[PDB]
Amino acid sequence: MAFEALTGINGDLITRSWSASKQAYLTERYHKEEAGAVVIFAFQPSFSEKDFFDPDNKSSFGEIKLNRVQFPCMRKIGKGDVATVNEAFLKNLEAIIDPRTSFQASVEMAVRSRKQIVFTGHSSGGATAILATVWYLEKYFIRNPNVYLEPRCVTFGAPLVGDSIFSHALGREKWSRFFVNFVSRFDIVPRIMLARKASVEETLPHVLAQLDPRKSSVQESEQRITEFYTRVMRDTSTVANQAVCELTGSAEAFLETLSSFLELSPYRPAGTFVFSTEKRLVAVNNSDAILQMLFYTSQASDEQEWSLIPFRSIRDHHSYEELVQSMGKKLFNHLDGENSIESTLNDLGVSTRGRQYVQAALEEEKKRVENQKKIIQVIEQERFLKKLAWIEDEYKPKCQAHKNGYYDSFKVSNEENDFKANVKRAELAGVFDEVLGLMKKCQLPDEFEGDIDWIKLATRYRRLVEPLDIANYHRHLKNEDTGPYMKRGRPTRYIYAQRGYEHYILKPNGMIAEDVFWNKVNGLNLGLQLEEIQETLKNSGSECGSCFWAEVEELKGKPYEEVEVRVKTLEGMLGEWITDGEVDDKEIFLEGSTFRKWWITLPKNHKSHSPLRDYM
Template identity: 40%
Template structure:
């Protein structure tokens, strides 16, 4: 078991960031709020850091926080042209993001010198740091992801990884947003500082679209330029209390729902609850550093645990304070600069990620671990209920890694089965048979054995797909190169056998074309997986479906469909065949004289074959046959 550990600041998920850099970030972020000339401030930090800090101003207009046209929580699909990586590969679904924040960032790119200044800093080999307080932090997050997309996915070696440091920033993206950052290994670029009593970071957990009037009043109240911070009128106190309890009530529902899922309580009641109560889609990502009232910092990376801590820290620490002073939680939002600098002076950071079973039962822990856990309990003012929820989050994360370990144990089994099928294909060629046609005919024992391997592999890959659909594997799994390569090899080698089996049993006559109705999800996913890893256009690597294309065009022609109606598909297929054979994604056995492909092509109209881009290749096959 890995214990909770005390560590200096440079070990707290900050990737070696210096205290002075964080202090510059918070100071510049607060200054950006008061800037009336630019939506962002740029500061160059010389010395060993040698970085350019871009600090974004927050907005105090409710329209820049919530877009009511996009539902109660103001979320919409991410702009895939700006953020192509922010998607779920197995579900083929884009991430969702706060539309108001996204719109503000898009406008910033169009109307300011942001892109010019970033390009200039990158050309000078400076490390780029994006920072912001409040909604300025949300803009900093989007700027960071945009830069990662723009430079690192295309030219990783020549660019330094950017950093994003936010203070009291509201949540901005959904679970798929979080997952994509983990998959790309970008989550480590984000560091979020949160005061335990600051309500703003978790405010998107409430349906703000129905609270726009209240939110506008609160934004005016907490604006750094506001003159009403000392106001304690009955009206504003009532408003703040209502907002506080609305956020807390929604956060409690999400906390309980998430814990039930983490503990495997996937009952019908949860589905019924989701049908009646619309839950906020927002989820934290990156490293969160909670600033405790005693000056200690608690660093957490587990997104489910962060979600629980956002709720319980606020509820436990501010219950009585809220009754005595309703303005307290909102004033806290503006005190980051003074309080955080004081915390940084202490250089006292505790990791809160390793919340294993034994951490909850101090009697079973090592004596040297007990003071650290007790300290963490005291620092965050959390009760046993909170720790049960945190334990569920930690245990769920460990279960996902155990699942991955079990899947990894099948890696060699998959490799061995693919090697057997590779040998089967080589044996078919020695017999003068095309791999596809031999399997489709199923005349020999080797064909039967190959089918057994096909079914065995289908079971192994379907298990992986189902785990990914249910988020039962670590988010980084989809980013593992060795599995992407194995999935691609599997797709190229085995999908032709699935297609052969499909048309051998004439399933197309009842179900429809393989590409439309019959293609299993395991092949669709492995194709998308490879295209994403290779930064290829979506749907551009269909070579494993070659035989399905041949079968469908052939079926249409056999049904007396005029050649003019299938000509475009034939031309496209011929062009692809030329490329796929050259790249060895198609093997030469497709050109064996008796193959389905050769027979089909030879039956095409003579005037078409004469001008075909593969005419020389096919004529050579005809002469050798």
């Protein structure tokens, strides 16, 4: 059918997921169920206030930043910002994955047997399932996508978990397709965490008692329920209005002036959401459209409706058994791929204005795709590629035949070829800075920074042209105006290219570039503690192979006793740099090179034991 064709799961799996979720109420912290070729891990939900807001967190929404070592993929690559999640849910997962529980050994056993693994849960068990799926992806799937098979995550009325960087990172890695979230139309738990803590502090415990399917002895005082609902929906309206105003670039200056004064929730949807009514099942993939729908599907249409909605929103958290039993009868639509959405959203209770804003949310993604197509068309042209080809095939060999190298030529010479190279450097900087400017404003799809062709082209451009920008910086004495290149001079486009390439190369093996560099430094045996080395090698040019000339300019002219350690580190990294093609070994040992002329004046004691003694 269309449901399975879209999501990759069938009715039998959904039924088994719901059954395991029901069983999970009794077991302690999780339950495992084995059925033929499928293994299901179901997580227990909780109904205390401290299970949604951590009592020791001092922020207004109970969020915390993830650890870059444990979740190295959950960030923005070029910018370098990590993602944030709910603290209580993360602590729950950390308790479960503690070696004293046997969860990890069970997961490993399931992996060895080559079965299909599923994480599932109801209520906050669903949020724990989401975080467990991310943990499994990071720890197994990215290492060996053949030995470790794809996962599935199924949730029933779960609250939101992560922020917008969380969703962006899931989109870039192509992992969003594994997640599926079922939401009843009027269910309140998916909306709760769009509200400030101080808004719902007084009434949250009683509503959590009401929501617990096991507790039935508490009073259902209508006043507290109505108050809770009203406050949650007020904060939701604020968040949705600001979000839609922001994504269209409508009122930037007024929005910034006002932003100084507000506190808004950072949580966003992640994965595919499926809305259910008594007649339809609607699936959506776009995060912003889902936010708008979460606000607009819960509004009342008469004064008679308003008298039943606060209680309906609580009663609908216990209606997923009926949804699973009646799934096969209803209609199915996919919102993103339908020409006309008016009728579907009419049946879901969305008015004309909310329909406008949902339409805008979808149109923004269409615009991003068109922008990407324009960029690709530009960068595939032969006239564009001929500039890189010229630098590769004409300027470099000619400057090598002069026995001084193209870095020194660009730095000191006034010939026609140098003028041509300067013109082409500026021309290429224009294109790459336009792409950077579009990226910084979120005008491109989430998957752009992972595209292999773009990575290859940007790596080639960086390795070819960054040395000429360093030469340009030092020819005009800009280092005596605003300081060393590595601190304040380096353009952002090269940093983005370097980080993209490093992530692409290193993610299969788990470790990040900084620890790789620090281990390689420790391996040189300089005789120093980690802190002293970290202080001595701050803002150094030995992290990247295309900043070799910046490092050489900085160390040149100083006495050896002051720069011993930096000289040794650079000489240590040079051989690996040459092997990978980051540095050209036909350029830097020439007779008229700056590096050779400096290196041949160092003390002979150092030169005797240098690794490069035979090159020069």
